[PDB]
A paper describes a structure:
LGR4, along with its ligand R-spondin (RSPO), potentiates Wnt/β-catenin signaling by recruiting its signaling suppressor, E3 ligase Zinc and Ring Finger 3 (ZNRF3), and inducing its membrane clearance. ZNRF3/RNF43, LGR4, and RSPO form a ternary complex on the cell surface, which relieves ZNRF3/RNF43-mediated suppression of Wnt/β-catenin signaling and thereby potentiates pathway activation.
We determined its structure using cryo-EM at an overall resolution of 4.0 Å. RSPO2 Fu1-2 domains exhibited an elongated form comprising multiple β-hairpins stabilized by disulfide bonds. RSPO2-bound LGR4 structure is almost identical to the apo LGR4 structure with an overall RMSD of 0.40 Å, indicating that RSPO2 binding does not induce any conformational differences in the LGR4 structure. This is in sharp contrast to the ‘push-pull’ activation mechanism of related LGR1-3, in which hormone bound to the receptor sterically clashes with the membrane, causing an upward movement of the ECD to avoid the clash, resulting in receptor activation.
Author numbering:
A (entry chain A): 26 to 476, 520 to 822
B (entry chain B): 40 to 143
Write the structure that this text describes.
């Protein structure tokens, strides 16, 4: 390395780097030939007079981050070759005009981030070579018009991060050579009608983060303007003719603004404009004219009351690439033939209702297209015929009853959620490139599984091939259907064919079995429906789910299943009353009362099945058509509603039995006939309780997130335990009750006699 | 980590001083932010209320640029006219070599 004065280094070629040394005074021992000096990141607090006498040839001087506070006015005497001066990160608090008076050759002055509040009027006098100026991050409240009036050669000026709020007229009337002006992040809210007059060479203006509530008319005198930014402001109204005076604009920034109304002809005759984004223009209802604007690349209009689209859009714009018109009131779609450069279209949340065949005739570069949340109910079968590399499509939340498929082999993302009226299935041969898919009904996802994220998931609750699934599961439902039906119908004939005075104990046994038969016929629906759709349940799954049959089957299942519980406990009170009347009265006169009480349970069960009809989708939770899988408050909160009484019911009908058990004496059951009746009923309450836990215990699993249960096991136990009491109940009356034995003998004589 | 309010080893400096410029330093597959008193060549400062970050000079063929579209000085062979890089001076402007810019 070239020799240099310690402790700092010298690059050579009259370049000296003595920055970051913690010094508080100007370094010495440097050759007068030096042209550049950097002594930043030091502790030089104050500049003594003639600090740079032995150094005539500098052009670069750096003083950033030195906590400078005072400079001697003559400390910079003799430096006539300086061009660039950096004085940021200090505590000047004021521009040292006197010290910089003799800097004739200065071109770039940096004075930002120094807590400057005000400047003298005679500042910058004689600075004939100045071109750039850093004046951001200070406490300036007024624009130093008079000091700035003496810099005709200035080109770049920034006044960011300052407390400037108002700009008077002719604030920069002498800045002929000015090119770019920065004013972002300031407290400006008012602008005079002629604040910017004279800036004929202005190209770039920035006004972001200000308080302009009204659009300034002073901009109309900026013929050379090319880029304007005033986003993140309080602008609300863009009147027509605002951009009359600046016909060479290229890029604009107006987002993050409370704009409501926009002039109809505001943006016309702007050839060089490239982007256009409007959001929040609620008061706008008419399409802004675009005559004279033929180079827009991106067009976006959101939150407007625009109803129609002019037909000349695709014939005027040529290189338009991305178009968005969401959040509006568009009803009809004009012909899009011509927009060859178009690539993406978004028309979500509009009043469109139909799609015509020619609506997308001319599109060749389309890749992404969205129509979510519209009123579409019909689509032409050849609507997507004349399309090329279409990749992403979304028409979710609509009312299609069908879906054309031709010309969609290149699709990758497809979304159909919300189309409740769509029923048919989609062939996989047409969607070989499909990757992500969402459909209104899970059974539609059965074809595309590859055994490709298809939603909603086709879980075990909604199988595709086999309804029951497991072969050994399948036999049990077939097994239970036969035994339950045959025995149930048999016992009814025993009791009701005898023209004898039926007691209460015999009666209640009849109704439960009568009600129980409905489980058998309900299970028969399941085994038959599974058999018909053997290995092909998916195709019938959707129709069966939404069809009226599932409602009937669902209503049938809940009715009798509840009917048993709301009625078996009637036997308990009857048995207790009969037991109590044995040693109290010896006879029962409540038979009519029980007959009355018998019917009310059926109606109570009837309203249990009617309730899911009020809230649509309650029965449609699963193809099993049995409110049990996790659902939604209407259904979810309903599902817990049924089980709570039955679980509650299983406390009472037990305690009186225990209460009577303590009450009765042990020898009382030795030979009395009521022992047979009381012992028989004791078993139905025994089984119906224990077999009701697994269905009840599994229903609370979604409320207990600590335990996760596999859906296949979830479905399995319901298919084997929920209707299990149906088959089991008549077996006890047919193989254990001695009373039925004599009843079977009674009808045996009756059939032979007849 | 020099002059950094919150510096690490992998992420490097995560937040410089309130007035000091924060620049993301990328070295091959290793990248970490750091603190620099001013933007280096090919970069222009962007003062913001939250914090200050170095911004690459998008302006073509420019060594150091003043702002988004204004260049302090371009490279050799590309003259300076209104802060722009031009191989030759346009009509009405004469070439200048020693100080490398356009003149009348």
């Amino acid at each position: 390395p070239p020799l240099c004065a310690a402790p700092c280094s010298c690059d050579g070629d009259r370049r000296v780097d003595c920055s970051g040394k913690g010094l508080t005074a100007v370094p010495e021992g440097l050759s007068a030939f030096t042209q550049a000096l950097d002594i930043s990141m030091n502790n030089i607090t104050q500049l003594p007079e003639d600090a740079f006498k032995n150094f005539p040839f500098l052009e670069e001087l750096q003083l950033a981050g030195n906590d400078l506070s005072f400079i001697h006015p003559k400390a910079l005497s003799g430096l006539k070759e300086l061009k660039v001066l950096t004085l940021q990160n200090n505590q000047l608090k004021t521009v040292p005009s006197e010290a910089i008076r003799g800097l004739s050759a200065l071109q770039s002055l940096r004075l930002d981030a120094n807590h400057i509040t005000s400047v003298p009027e005679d500042s910058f006098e004689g600075l004939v070579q100045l071109r750039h100026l850093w004046l951001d991050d200070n406490s300036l409240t007024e624009v130093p018009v008079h000091p700035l009036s003496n810099l005709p050669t200035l080109q770049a000026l920034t006044l960011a991060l300052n407390k400037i709020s108002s700009i008077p007229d002719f604030a920069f009337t002498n800045l002929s050579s000015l090119v770019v002006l920065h004013l972002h992040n300031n407290k400006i809210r008012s602008l005079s009608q002629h604040c910017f007059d004279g800036l004929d060479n202005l190209e770039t203006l920035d006004l972001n983060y200000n308080n302009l509530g009204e659009f300034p008319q002073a901009i109309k005198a900026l013929p050379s303007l090319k880029e304007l930014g005033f986003h993140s402001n309080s602008i609300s109204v863009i009147p027509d003719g605002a951009f009359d005076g600046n016909p060479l604009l290229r890029t604009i920034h107006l987002y993050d603004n409370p704009l409501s109304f926009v002039g109809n002809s505001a943006f016309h005759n702007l050839s060089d404009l490239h982007s256009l984004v409007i959001r929040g223009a609620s008061m706008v209802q008419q399409f802004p004219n675009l005559t004279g604007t033929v180079h827009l690349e991106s067009l976006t209009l959101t939150g407007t009351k625009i109803s129609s689209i002019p037909n000349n859009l695709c014939q005027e714009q040529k290189m338009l690439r991305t178009l968005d018109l969401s959040y509006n009131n568009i009803r009809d779609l004009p012909s899009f033939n011509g927009c060859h450069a178009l690539e993406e279209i978004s028309l979500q949340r509009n009043q469109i209702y139909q799609i015509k065949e020619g609506t997308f005739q001319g599109l060749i570069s389309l890749r992404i297209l969205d129509l979510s949340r519209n009123l579409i109910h019909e689509i032409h079968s050849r609507a997507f015929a004349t399309l090329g590399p279409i990749t992403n499509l979304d028409v979710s939340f609509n009312e299609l009853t069908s879906f054309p498929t031709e010309g969609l082999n290149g699709l990758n993302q497809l979304k159909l959620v919300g189309n409740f009226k769509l029923k048919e299935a989609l062939a996989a041969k047409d969607f070989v490139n499909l990757r992500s898919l969402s459909v209104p009904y899970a059974y539609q996802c059965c074809a595309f599984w590859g055994c490709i994220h298809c939603t909603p998931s086709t879980g075990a609750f909604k199988p595709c091939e086999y309804l029951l699934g497991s072969w050994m599961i399948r036999l049990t439902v077939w097994f239970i259907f036969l035994v339950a039906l045959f025995f149930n119908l048999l016992v009814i004939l025993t009791t009701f064919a005898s023209c004898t005075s039926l007691p209460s104990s015999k009666l209640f046994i009849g109704l439960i079995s009568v009600s129980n038969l409905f489980m058998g016929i309900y299970t028969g629906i399941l085994t038959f429906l599974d058999a018909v759709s053997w290995g092909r349940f998916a195709e019938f799954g959707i129709w069966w789910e939404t069809g009226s049959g599932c409602k009937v089957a669902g209503f049938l299942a809940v009715f009798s299943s509840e009917s048993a519980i709301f009625l078996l406990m009637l036997a308990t009170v009857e048995r207790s009353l009969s037991a109590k009347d044995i040693m109290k009265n010896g006879k029962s006169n409540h038979l009519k009362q029980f007959r009355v009480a018998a019917l009310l349970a059926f109606l109570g069960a009837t309203v249990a099945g009617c309730f899911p009809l009020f809230h649509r989708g309650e029965y449609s939770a699963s193809p099993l058509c049995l409110p049990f899988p996790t659902g939604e408050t209407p259904s979810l909160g309903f599902t817990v509603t049924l089980v709570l009484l039955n679980s509650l019911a299983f406390l009472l009908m037990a305690v009186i039995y225990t209460k009577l058990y303590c009450n009765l004496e042990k020898e009382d059951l030795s030979e009395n006939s009521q022992s047979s009746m009381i012992k028989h009923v004791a078993w139905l309450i025994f089984t119906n309780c224990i077999f009701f836990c697994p269905v009840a215990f599994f229903s609370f699993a979604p409320l207990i997130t600590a335990i996760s249960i596999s859906p296949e096991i979830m479905k399995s136990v319901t298919l084997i335990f929920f209707p299990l009491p149906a088959c089991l109940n008549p077996v006890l009356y047919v193989f254990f009750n001695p009373k039925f034995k004599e009843d079977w003998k009674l009808l045996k004589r009756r059939v032979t006699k007849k | 980590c020099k002059g950094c309010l919150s510096c690490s080893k992998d992420n490097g400096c995560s937040r410089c001083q309130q007035k000091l410029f924060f620049f993301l330093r990328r070295e091959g597959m290793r990248q970490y932010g750091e603190c620099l008193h001013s933007c280096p060549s090919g970069y222009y400062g962007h003062r913001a209320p939250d914090m200050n970050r170095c911004a690459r000079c998008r302006i073509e063929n420019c060594d150091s640029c003043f702002s988004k579209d204004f260049c302090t000085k371009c490279k050799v062979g590309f003259y300076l006219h209104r802060g722009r890089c031009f191989d030759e001076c346009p009509d009405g402007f004469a070439p200048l070599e020693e100080t490398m810019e356009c003149v009348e």
